[PDB]
């Protein structure tokens, strides 16, 4: 294992997939062996040697541990860097990329734990994927929405409403100045709210709110389903209704179904909102699993227009992967957990979506941190307004525009954010009512 798979002299090729693994060896397993084992067990390592190995050149197909560095602060933890040749991977298959790199090694007994922190996806592999159906620039052009964050609301309660009452909440949300309402990740098709009923009533509500306001509106119609056939029937009806945006739970549906829906969305002009339900099973613990940035990069290849990127109540790490989702080129930056320089060779960016327990007083911080190319998703913060959904919506839209205006004038959102909101309460009764309820 040691002499074949630990190759500190190896110069990485531009076609190589590079992995940064956080490696926690078993006591008395030295780093060099840990690193070789990770390489070996994620590629061509066999427990006994076999004659068939002589029919090929395994140096062409081996993973190579080419660098090891200790982790500051931790006892017995290392970043192992591994190079995988391009030839390992099926073209355009995130399923295969994950299977090849993480399918086997995380159970290896010489490791106590293992986390994948980052992947350098080479540009030749990037070009085998469609990527986002539309991406940031195209979405803004289609929706005619420039120069601010977009605004959404998750409909609550997730279960218990009839399809008509759910649509009532959508209309009242959208008409007050939200761009989007949304299905909860859990809302697929259930006894009290069958999917096609929901789709139909959401369409009526969305179109009423668009005719009333004159702004383009969307509702994230959740097409996540048990089978590919079911998922497609749902996306098809969305196409038939003429509505702009569907959604998928990409981790629980999985990459194979996700990439099918991403291709359908490009072929039929549908935006695709991506929910990251189940990410925390994988990405929460520092010692074991896969960092979200890896899941984000994977989504940008398989394809979606939006991806849930979390609340921001470390900031630097979040800002790290937000740049990985949006930009064409991100340079290595260890302070932001970017282990590799990443190019996307004009693959479109994905809009990050901020959600959780946010309300009007969060608006300056969120606008400062994310900037314009983001979606800010209220649930409680719209529906919990004392005057109902439309005033909820107006409060959020006013707070946002107030912040955007203040930022454009040269005001510091970090220092004057509270004051910007207070000023707007003087002329917006809707916002004044919200500001009494929260903080």
């Amino acid at each position: 294992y040691k002499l074949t798979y630990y190759t500190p002299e190896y110069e990485t090729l531009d076609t190589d997939i590079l992995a940064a693994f956080r490696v926690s060896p078993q006591p008395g397993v030295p780093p060099e062996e840990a690193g070789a084992a990770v390489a070996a067990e994620s590629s061509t390592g066999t427990w006994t040697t076999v004659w068939t190995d002589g029919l090929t050149n395994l140096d062409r197909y081996k993973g190579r541990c080419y660098h090891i560095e200790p982790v500051a602060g931790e006892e017995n933890q290392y970043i192992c860097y591994v190079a995988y040749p391009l030839d390992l991977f099926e073209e355009g298959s995130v399923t295969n990329m994950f299977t090849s790199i993480v399918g086997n090694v995380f159970g290896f007994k010489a490791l106590r734990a293992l986390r994948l922190e980052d992947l350098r996806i080479p540009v030749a592999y990037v070009k085998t994927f469609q990527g986002p159906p539309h991406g940031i620039q195209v979405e803004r052009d289609k929706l005619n929405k420039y120069g601010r964050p977009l605004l959404g609301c998750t409909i609550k309660p997730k279960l218990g409403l009839s399809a008509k009452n759910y649509g009532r909440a959508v209309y009242e949300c959208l008409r007050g100045g939200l761009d989007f309402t949304k299905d909860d990740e859990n809302v697929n098709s259930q006894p009290f709210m069958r999917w096609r009923d929901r789709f139909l009533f959401c369409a009526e509500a969305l179109y009423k709110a668009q005719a009333e306001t004159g702004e383009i509106k969307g509702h994230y119609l959740n097409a996540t389903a048990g089978t590919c056939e079911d998922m497609m029937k749902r996306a098809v009806f969305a196409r038939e209704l003429g509505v702009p945006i569907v959604m998928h739970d990409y981790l629980t549906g999985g990459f194979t179904a996700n990439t099918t829906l991403s291709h359908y969305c490009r072929d039929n002009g549908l935006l695709l909102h991506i929910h990251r339900a189940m990410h925390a099973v994988i990405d929460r613990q520092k010692n074991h699993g896969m960092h979200f940035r890896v899941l984000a990069k994977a989504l940008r290849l398989s394809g979606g227009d939006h991806i849930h990127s979390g609340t921001v109540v470390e900031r630097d790490i979040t800002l790290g992967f937000v740049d990985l989702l949006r930009d064409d080129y991100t340079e290595k930056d260890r302070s932001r957990g970017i282990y590799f320089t990443q190019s996307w060779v004009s693959t479109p960016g994905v809009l990050p979506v901020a959600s959780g327990g946010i309300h009007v007083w969060h608006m300056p911080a969120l606008t400062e941190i994310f900037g314009d190319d983001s979606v800010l998703q209220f649930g409680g913060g719209t529906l919990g307004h004392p005057w109902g959904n439309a005033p909820g919506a107006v409060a959020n839209r006013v707070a946002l525009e107030a912040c955007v205006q203040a930022r454009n004038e040269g005001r510091d959102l970090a220092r004057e954010g509270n004051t910007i909101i207070r000023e707007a309460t003087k002329w917006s009764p809707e916002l004044a009512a919200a500001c009494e309820v929260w903080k």
């Binding site: 620039q137 803004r140 052009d141 289609k142 005619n144 929405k145 420039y146 120069g147 601010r148 008409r175 007050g176 100045g177 668009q210 009333e212 306001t213 004159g214 702004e215 383009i216 969305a238 196409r239 003429g242 509505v243 702009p244 039929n268 002009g269 549908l270 935006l271 004392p386 005057w387 439309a390 005033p391 107006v394 839209r397 006013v398 525009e401 107030a402 955007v404 205006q405 454009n408 004038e409 040269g410 002329w427 009764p429 809707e430």
Partner: protein
Amino acid sequence: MKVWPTQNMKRYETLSYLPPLTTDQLARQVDYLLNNKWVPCLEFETDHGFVYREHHNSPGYYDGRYWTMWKLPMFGCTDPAQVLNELEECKKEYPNAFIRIIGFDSNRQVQCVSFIAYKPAGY
């Protein structure tokens, strides 16, 4: 407890939920464009002012997104007053038009700004 009105409550995207911009406020929004090296341009519309669907209804197709360009983008504009002057000339020729200021980022290669500068009376 106020009810948000339904009637004559059409909006025009970014900044249209704020009070109408004063001359000074307009000039500061144009200064932001110029400080970012974005090219300001004016766009006007006499007929609708909102999005609708006449010619097609497939996903992401709407009519009423394109308005009409007033002249050309103002390349190498250094002073907000030059934009405000064009705004006044446009209002003079089309007092019945909606007028928005748009911005082009030649580096990102897209339109990046769109805000309403003038509405006719009743709107």
